[PDB]
Amino acid sequence: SFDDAVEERVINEEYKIWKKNTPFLYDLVMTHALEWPSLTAQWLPDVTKQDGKDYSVHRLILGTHTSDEQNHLLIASVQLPSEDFGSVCGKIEIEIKINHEGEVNRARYMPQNACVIATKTPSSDVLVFDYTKHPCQPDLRLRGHQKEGYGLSWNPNLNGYLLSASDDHTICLWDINATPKEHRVIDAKNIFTGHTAVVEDVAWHLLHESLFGSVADDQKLMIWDTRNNNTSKPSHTVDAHTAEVNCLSFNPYSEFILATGSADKTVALWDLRNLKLKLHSFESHKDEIFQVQWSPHNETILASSGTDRRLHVWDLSKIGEEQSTEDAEDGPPELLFIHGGHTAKISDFSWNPNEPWIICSVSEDNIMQVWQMAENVYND
């Protein structure tokens, strides 16, 4: 159609421009086309090195989206710059592969033992694998609910405790260590309802093992306390957004600050000490927002991605500082950087935990990008 065509046209012309400015806007930009689109992406904690090599190796947990052929759980190794047949391999390879029944919606490793990877299937089961066992039939099948989902959150502080969101208006909680397994199957320690609609995302508080937050299409943010008795009584409910809320992430350097992304094209800043007053609303995205992640290195900065094909990076510290018109355009002072290297909807992204400022983002066209904005943008 005409609109599709016009759209596709602007996307290319803009991309054209982007690529030309690459050396000016970035310090690192790596593009790579997977054989299949990945809906998930998360960096693994470890870093591998060799003496004499000008690079270190990092790894990502990716997935495949084949609405046909066989799907797999992937582990990709990426070579990253250091302080400075039989030929040298490419900077990106797929070290591990694991047959997975259906697309991989999410895939997160367990903080306590990253050999453990939890998965979100297009089914209603939640799978668990140990990529030390398959070196495929999951090592654990988590019962819990009737619908598909994406929300997935491992609890630090409590080995094994996993949370999940679902299109069936509920949240499940399991103890992966679950005594017995009755045929690789662990039922569900608790099911939190309290949500009028589809639950988009879920996330554990980072310090208090009994707290966690949920987010759903009912336009609300709910804070829960595992200790409470009513599996329908969220200890708190917040009218967070105009549209449906798609995610929430806790600030790594705080025990109160939180963030949420909505279809209302907005990212809301929240403080647990007073969920009655929204601290701020980051605006600029032109379509739905599905991912929001805080920098693992700076308490003041977070990023968001969505359907508008843009990855935004914000800086709380610049909220409110005055800016010069015709500069006061392009966006508010809180918008530190805009990543326009993706040519399709960004499905998910992850901040590298060892290399401050490196981000990996997977797009729907099955493109993967490892990038780092130019130092000057966040320095001087």
**Order of strands in the sheet with the most strands?**
6-7-8-9-13
The number of distinct β-strands equals 29
Task: Name the CATH homologous superfamily.
Answer: YVTN repeat-like/Quinoprotein amine dehydrogenase
Name the CATH architecture: 7 Propeller
Keywords: Chromatin regulator, Nucleus, Phosphoprotein, Repeat, Repressor, Transcription, Transcription regulation, WD repeat
GO biological process, one term: facultative heterochromatin formation
GO molecular function: histone binding; histone deacetylase binding; protein homodimerization activity; transcription cis-regulatory region binding
Protein name: Chromatin assembly factor 1 p55 subunit
Write a concise keyword list for the protein shown above.
monomer, 380 residues, mainly beta, Methylamine Dehydrogenase, Chain H, 5-stranded mixed beta sheet, 4-stranded antiparallel beta sheet, 29 strands, transcription repressor, WD40, Nucleus
Fold and architecture overview:
- The protein is mainly beta and 380 residues long.
- It has one domain (1-380): Methylamine Dehydrogenase, Chain H, CATH 2.130.10.
- It contains 1 helix and 29 strands.
- The protein has one helix spanning 2-25, and strands at residues 26-33, 41-48, 55-63, 71-81, 92-100, 106-109, 116-120, 126-130, 140-142, 152-154, 161-165, 171-175, 185-186, 190-192, 199-204, 211-216, 220-225, 236-239, 245-250, 257-262, 266-271, 280-283, 289-294, 301-306, 311-315, 335-339, 346-351, 358-363, 367-373.
- The strands form 7 sheets. It has a 5-stranded mixed beta sheet with strand order 6-7-8-9-13, with no helix packed on it.
- β7 and β8 (126-130) form a beta hairpin.
